[PDB]
Design a protein around this ligand. Structure first.
Ligand SMILES: NS(=O)(=O)c1ccc(-c2ccc(Cn3cccn3)cc2)cc1
Ligand SMILES: [Zn+2]
Length: 258
């Protein structure tokens, strides 16, 4: 009886195995655009993905992860609110059963159809397991997805999903360029928070871009054909794999833009 997103094991139950679920810096949060303060001391974000090496795509029973070689500084995030160099390890998404829900962060209570998380870890801690134990261990770049025009750079991901339909399935996934998933603007909000799934560790500097990307209805429909279950188990579609907004508590959300 492990955690997940159903009635009996979903977000409102997580605190029983993971007490930090009720902590002081949990994620996601609602971004109140009028209360966020412009911080003119925040630097432009530096996204350096030209040498990125994607390796594999994995259905882990909660989402699918596109994994990267993070054994060298090849795809890194710096600048913005960050001190130091953070290495891209994987990206994944959270999405809905309907286009009106699916994102984890909200903007003035608006839910997007999905949200992309590009996960990076602070190289001063040596590797990812060590980084998640530190309050500045990870930087997760969050990007909202709305349904409209297709995102051509997403299509290679959409088309391999039938090969990883069920939990524990993986596929080779080389040469995928995550630059094709970025909006034009890197204007962002930033605050200190947590992993949005167990173990819910409070180790994340969140950097959420204001500009959503558009994906097509057909692209998101293909996310919703994935399964939470393993092969040979009863079929339960992988939809609504999002945690709702958590209390902001004693935090301020900062804007890079006016
Ligand atoms: N991007 S996000 O949705 O907040 C998000 C990102 C990462 C994880 C995550 C992190 C660590 C583990 C366990 N672990 C693996 C190696 C060492 N520890 C499992 C999941 C959960 C949610
Ligand atoms: Zn995530």
């Amino acid at each position: 009886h492990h955690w997940g997103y159903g009635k009996h094991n979903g977000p409102e139950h997580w605190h029983k195995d993971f007490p930090i679920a009720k902590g002081e810096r949990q994620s996601p949060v609602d971004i109140d655009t009028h209360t966020a303060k412009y911080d003119p001391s925040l630097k432009p974000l530096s996204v350096s993905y030209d040498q990125a090496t994607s390796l594999r795509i994995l259905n882990n029973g909660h989402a699918f992860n596109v994994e990267f070689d993070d054994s060298q500084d090849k795809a890194v995030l710096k600048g913005g609110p960050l001190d130091g160099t953070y290495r891209l390890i994987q990206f994944h998404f959270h999405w809905g059963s309907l286009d009106g829900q699916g994102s984890e962060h909200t903007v003035d209570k608006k839910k997007y159809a999905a949200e992309l998380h590009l996960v990076h870890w602070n190289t001063k801690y040596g590797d990812f397991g060590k980084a998640v134990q530190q309050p500045d261990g990870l930087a997760v770049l969050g990007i909202f997805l709305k349904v409209g025009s297709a995102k051509p750079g997403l299509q290679k991901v959409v088309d391999v999903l039938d090969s990883i339909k069920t939990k524990g399935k993986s596929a080779d996934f080389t040469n995928f360029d995550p630059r094709g998933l970025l909006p034009e603007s890197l204007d962002y909000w930033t605050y200190p928070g947590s992993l949005t799934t167990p173990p819910l560790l409070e180790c994340v500097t969140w950097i959420v871009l204001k500009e959503p990307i558009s994906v097509s209805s057909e692209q998101v429909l293909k996310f919703r054909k994935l399964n939470f279950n393993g092969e040979g188990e009863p079929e339960e579609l992988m939809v609504d794999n999002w945690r709702p907004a958590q209390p902001l508590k004693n935090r301020q959300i900062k804007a890079s833009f006016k």
